Amino acid sequence: RELAEIGLEGYAPYLMNRIMGRYNANLRKEMTALGLSTAKMRALAILSAKDGLPIGTLGIFAVVEQSTLSRALDGLQADGLVRREVDDQRSSRVYLTPAGRAVYDRLWPHMRASHDRMFQGITPQERQAFLATLNKMLANIRVHEI
């Protein structure tokens, strides 16, 4: 019932926090290199998969607090990597520019390298099963139904 009894290696949050800690740490290394923060790296990645998002929705997908994300977008826009336009819902949507995708495409090899490392010697069947379980857990835990 209690954590001592379960063991850290039988407690999914321990494992996931540590795996993601290393994945994230590895990308952090490339920050000063790309002139990008974590918030910016996350925003570009999400936008590369799906463009034209309201800020609030982007922040939920990216796991970035809204004020932190707004500052990140200000920076990305200043550098020509994203553009923002007002809706008539009196709000704004964010779009990836070709310059922004070019920058994102130079980040992807590090994301891919860590993704491929973490999955070494795990079969396509085990991966499929893994992703299915994660999607169920995300549906279960999430506060926002997206």
Added chain:
Amino acid sequence: RELAEIGLEGYAPYLMNRIMGRYNANLRKEMTALGLSTAKMRALAILSAKDGLPIGTLGIFAVVEQSTLSRALDGLQADGLVRREVDDQRSSRVYLTPAGRAVYDRLWPHMRASHDRMFQGITPQERQAFLATLNKMLANIRVHEI
């Protein structure tokens, strides 16, 4: 090959970052309540499972940067929740006090609540398979062999 094609929901780091973001966010809510920071919450949890750790090892298990962790332990010790002793390896080890375990035991219900929520309607067999895959991924990705 690329993220757009994979889809966010087929990309494990997106899912794990978001699930952990919510798990962690939920615990953060209880911070000001317990007079505890994230670093302290993580340190108590790890120590509750295994006591008498060198700082460096604790920081790796807890996913807390060393200076941040040292400050957290200073606070926990000041409040009688942990104790530190020097080795003859001229370094120090950290131990949970009964007061510290009492505090940790009042944090656990929130950890358990989120753990149980995330696993709702996932069978013991699916969970077993999930944890097996996570352990493989941790072995694959980790820089420190512990």
